[PDB]
Amino acid sequence: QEKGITIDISRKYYSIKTLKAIVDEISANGGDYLQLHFSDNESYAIASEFLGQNSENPNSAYLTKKELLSLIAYSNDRNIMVIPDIDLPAHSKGWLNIMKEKDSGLYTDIVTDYSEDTLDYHNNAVALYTANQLLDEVLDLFYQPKFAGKQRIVLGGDEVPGSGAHQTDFIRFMNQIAKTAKASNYEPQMWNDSITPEGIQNLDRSFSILYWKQSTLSNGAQSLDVQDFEENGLSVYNYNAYSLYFLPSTRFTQEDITEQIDYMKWAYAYNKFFYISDYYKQVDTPNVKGSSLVFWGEHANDLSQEGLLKQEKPLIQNFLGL
C-alpha cells in the first residue's frame, strides 16, 4: 500500500525551499511519492521550452528547470518518487492560453469549440500532436533512473466536458497519450470521474486510476465504482475528495487544522472511497494500491510560505501515520 502527497502548484506558487521542506516531512514519515500537479486552468507552473517558459531565474510564475531537477534529486535521495501530473484534455487553460499567444493559428486548430479550457480530444490530429510535444518534454524532465520501470505519470482525465456524450473520442484520446507515456516506460494514470460504463471496456489496461469521487451519469444513474475497475483489471488509488482533499487558506487557525486532523483520523482509511451512497465506503478488492492526501491551491492566494507549511506539515505527518 503506497502513500503519496499531492501538491497543486498550478493554483499556488510554492518556493523550492517550501517544497523541499514538504519532502523532508514525507521522508521522515515513510511516504512513497510526491505527485506534482503543475498544469491546470490557472497556470503551467514549471519551466517549458515548448511553451516559452525558459527563465533560469526564480520567479513567482514557475519553478525553473534547475529548481525542479533539484527537487526531484532531493526526493530520490530520500527514496521518494516524483510523479508529474499534467492534466489533459481539460484543466488545460493555462497552457492553452500560452498557445493562444504563441501561435494563434495552431490554437484555433487544437482548442474545443466551446471550452477555452479543453483541448480538442475529438479525434483531432494536430491537437494530439501538440499535446504529445508537451508530454515528451515532461517525461524527459521527470526521468528518474533510481525508479526505472516504476515511473508513473498522471495524465488528467478529470471533469472533461462532453465526455459522457463523446466517450469513444475521450477514451481514444486517453489511450493515445497513454502510448506516449508507455513508450518512455512510464505507467499512465488518470482520474476516475469521466470514464463511463460505455468507455471502460476500451480503456488501455496499463492505466491506473486515481479514485476521488464516484460520478453520476448525465441520466441520473450511478457510474463506475472500484469493483468495476477491478473487473477491468485496473488498479486504483484512493484520493477520497472528503477525507483526503484539503485546501490551505489564511482563513484557518491552527485549531481549525487540528479539527481537520481529528476528522481525517476517523474518516480516512486507505480503502475507504467516496461513493454516492457512502462517503467512506470500505472496499476490499485486491486492485487497491494506495492513497494520497491532496493539497489544492484554490484558496491559498495570500498564504505565506510559512503558513503553507504550518497547515500542511501536520496533515502530512498525520496522514502518513494512519
DSSP category for residue 164? T
Query: 241 near 252, Cβ under 8 Å?
Result: no
Question: What method did the depositors use to determine the structure?
Answer: X-ray
Three-state SS at 37: strand
Give rounded-to-5 percent helix, strand, coil for the chain. 40, 20, 45
Please report, for residues 168, 252, 253, the alpha-carbon distance to residue 256 in angstroms, rounded to integers and kept in the order given: 44, 6, 5
Query: 318 near 264, Cβ under 8 Å?
Result: yes
Identity of the residue numbered 250: T
| Residue 180 burial by Cβ neighbours in a 10 Å radius (0-12, 13-18, 19+) | buried
Query: 315 near 27, Cβ under 8 Å?
Result: no
In DSSP terms, which residues pair with 126 in a beta bridge?
Answer: none
Vertex 253: Cα angle to 247 and 254 (nearest 5): 95
Query: 185 near 216, Cβ under 8 Å?
Result: no
Report the top-level CATH class of 2-321.
alpha beta
Active-site residues, by number, are 159
| 321 phi/psi in degrees, rounded to 5 | -85, -25
Angle at which helices 125-141 and 65-77 cross, to 10°: 60
d(CA 99, CA 103): 6
3-state secondary structure 227-277: HHHHHCCCEEEECCCCCCEECCCCCCCHHHHHHHHHHHHHHCCCCEECCCC
d(CA 195, CA 315): 30
Pairing of strands 288-295, 235-238: parallel
Locate the DSSP E strands across the chain.
2-8, 33-39, 81-88, 152-156, 187-191, 208-211, 235-238, 245-246, 272-273, 281-282, 288-295
Residue 60: which residues within 8 A CB-CB, separation 6 or more? 13
Please report, for residues 31, 141, 154, 304, the alpha-carbon distance to residue 138 in angstroms, rounded to integers and kept in the order given: 23, 5, 11, 28
Residue where the block lists cell 515548448? 50
Query: 73 near 142, Cβ under 8 Å?
Result: no
| 189 phi/psi in degrees, rounded to 5 | -130, 150
| Residue 56 burial by Cβ neighbours in a 10 Å radius (0-12, 13-18, 19+) | exposed
Helix (H) or strand (E) holding 141: helix 125-141
DSSP category for residue 122? S
d(CA 80, CA 73): 9
Helix (H) or strand (E) holding 108: helix 104-110
| 67 phi/psi in degrees, rounded to 5 | -60, -50
Please report, for residues 16, 39, 122, 123, 129, the alpha-carbon distance to residue 126 in angstroms, rounded to integers and kept in the order given: 35, 20, 11, 9, 5
- Phi-psi category of 279—alpha, beta or left, where left has phi over 0 and alpha has psi -120 to 50? alpha
